[model samples]
Target: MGHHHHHHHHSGDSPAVTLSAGNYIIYNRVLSPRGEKLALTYPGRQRTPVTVSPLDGSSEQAWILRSYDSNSNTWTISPVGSPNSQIGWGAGNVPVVLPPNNYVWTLTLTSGGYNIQDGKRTVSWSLNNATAGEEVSIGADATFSGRWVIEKV
Candidate 1:
C-alpha cells in the first residue's frame, strides 16, 4: 500500500450556486426564495414544483426556464403539461395552469436574493415548512420571504 504525505486542513466550503435572469436554472442548486432547493415533487407523474432536500444535481425535473426578465415572469408556455393554461398559484401552495396574468409572478433581484411576487396577491413563491423534501407554494403577502438562488446550469 502506498502512503500519503503530510496532511492538510480544511477551512470552509463555497457558497451555494445561484443563477441570474437569463440562464437556464439547473444542477439542482437553485434555492427557492425560501432557501430550499427547487425540485419536482414526483418525477413520473404530473406533480407540482416543490422545495426538497439533498439537491440532486443531475435531476432532469429540477431544471427550469427563466423568462430573462428582471422579474421572474411566468412562462409563455407553462412548464407543466397541458396547453392553453397559464401557471397560477392557488388555495394551497399548489400551482395551476390558469389563464394568463392570473397567477403570474415577477422576480426582482434583492440584496439577499430574488423577490418572487405575484402582482395581485403580492404573494411570493414559497417552500413551505422549510423541511427537506417539502412542497412549494404561494405563501402569504410577504414579498420578501421567497429568496431564490438561481443555479447556472
Candidate 2:
C-alpha cells in the first residue's frame, strides 16, 4: 500500500497593494514503477489543478490548487466544492479508471495578482493512458488543473 498527504495555507491581510501578475510554478514528485522520481508540472494562470494517479483504485488521488484571499485571508478555489469521489480532472472522467501501477502527478497556478478578477479562477485536467508509464503535459490560463497517471501493464 502507498501513502498520501495534503497541505494548505491562508493569509491574514491583503498585501496592502495588489502585486504585479507573474507566473507561478507548482510541481510534485512521486516514485515510478521503476522506482524513479517522476516530476509533474501544472502550468497556467488559474487555480485548481488536480492530479489523478493509479486510476484503477477505488478513489483516484487528487491534488487541488488553492489560493489565499488577502482581504479575508481565506484559501479558496472554484468549481465550488470538493471534487466528487469518482471525479478526476473534468466532468464525466470521474473516478479515473486506469491500469494498475504507480504515478506522480501535480497541479499549479501562476497568476500576476494584478490581473485577478472577482477573487480567482479555477481549472482542471484529466488522463487516458493508451500506453503505460506515459508522460502527459497540459497548459491553461494562470489558473488551471491537470492529472498524470503511470500504469503498469
Candidate 3:
C-alpha cells in the first residue's frame, strides 16, 4: 500500500497594522498551511481593537483582547467585552492615543481549508476597517499538499 503526503507553507511576514490620522489601529491575520499562527502587540495603555474579515464577505470576524507588558515581557489574553463569533470587540480600559502610544493589538488566523486527499489549496485573508478609509487587502496565501508522489503495488 502507498500513502500520500500533504504540506502547506506560508509566504511572507504577517500584514502590518496601519493607523491613520484618527483613533483606531487596524490589522489582520491570514490562516494557511494548517496550524499557522501570528501575533501583534501594542505595549501601551490605549486599548486598540483588532478585527478579522473573511474574504468571502460572509461576516466580520473579531479577535480576543491581548496585551504585552514591556517591563516584564509577559503576555495576557482577555475578552473584549464582546461575544465571540464572526465579529466582536475586546474590551479594555486603556485609551487610544497616537503620540503617547497607549495600546497594543494583535490578530491571528488559522487556515481551515486543507485536504490531504486533494492537491494544493489556497486560502486568503482580507482587511476590513470601517472607520479607516482603508480598502480590502489580501494578507497572504496558504498552500497545502506536496508535489511529490509515488505509486506502489
Candidate 4:
C-alpha cells in the first residue's frame, strides 16, 4: 500500500518585472546608498553632460524610453518631460543630454538589472566612483558602475 499527501495552494497577482516604453527611474545598481539617479546637468537644456546625482524625485531624474526595436533590442532613452532631449555620447564617451538625433541604446538584461549600452555597442554608461554628481561615461561593463536598474515610476 501507498499513501500521498497534499498541500493547499494560493496565487497572488503582483506587477511583473518587465521593461517597456514608460517612465522609469534609471540608476546605477551598485552605487552607494542606492538613491542617486541619472540626470542632466541642466534639465531641459540640450548638449549638457549627464551625471549620477542625488535623487530629489524631480522630473529631471526620471527617464522615458521609446521606440523599442525588438529585433535589435534597442530603445531611445530620454529624460522625462524633456521630449526633445535624448541620451547621447560626446567626445571621450561622455554621456550627454542632447537634442534628439536618433541615438538609441541597447538595454541588456544583467543580474536582474540592465546595462545601458551606447550606440557604439562596446561600452555602457558607468560612474567612476561611488559618489553623487559623478559624470557618467561609457566604460567597461565589469564594474558595478556599469549595472543599471530601470524601475517604472
The model with the greatest lDDT is 4
The local lDDT score (0 to 100) that residue 28 gets in candidate 2 is 24
Candidate 1 Cα errors over 4 Å, as ranges: 1-23, 26-43, 47-51, 66-87, 91-93, 96-103, 141-145
Q: What is the C-alpha lDDT of each candidate?
A: 0.45, 0.28, 0.26, 0.69
lDDT of 3 by residue, 1-153 (tens): 333336432343232232122221123333323343222222223334333222221112212323354343222222222322111123331112232223333323233221111011232223333222233223343232111111111
lDDT score for residue 125 of model 1? 65
Encode model 2's per-residue lDDT on 1-153: one tens digit a residue: 333344433243222322222212222223345443333322221223433233322212223334344453333222112222111232332223222222212223233221211112232332333222343433332322233222111
Which is better, 1 or 2, measured by lDDT? 1
lDDT of 1 by residue, 17-122 (tens): 3444332342122445556555433323233443345455544333444353444344332333332343455566565445455344564544444445565545
Sort order, TM-score high to low: 4, 1, 2, 3
After the best TM-score superposition of candidate 3, give how far the Cα of residue 93 lies from its true spot, in angstroms. Answer: 31
User: TM-score of the candidate numbered 4?
Assistant: 0.78
TM-score of every candidate relative to the true structure: 0.51, 0.19, 0.18, 0.78
Query: Runs in model 4 with CA error above 4 Å?
Result: 1-16, 33-44
Model 1 gets an lDDT of 0.45
Better of 1 and 4 by lDDT: 4
- For model 4, residues 49-99, the per-residue Cα lDDT tens digits are 786676666877777878657878888888766767788777677877787
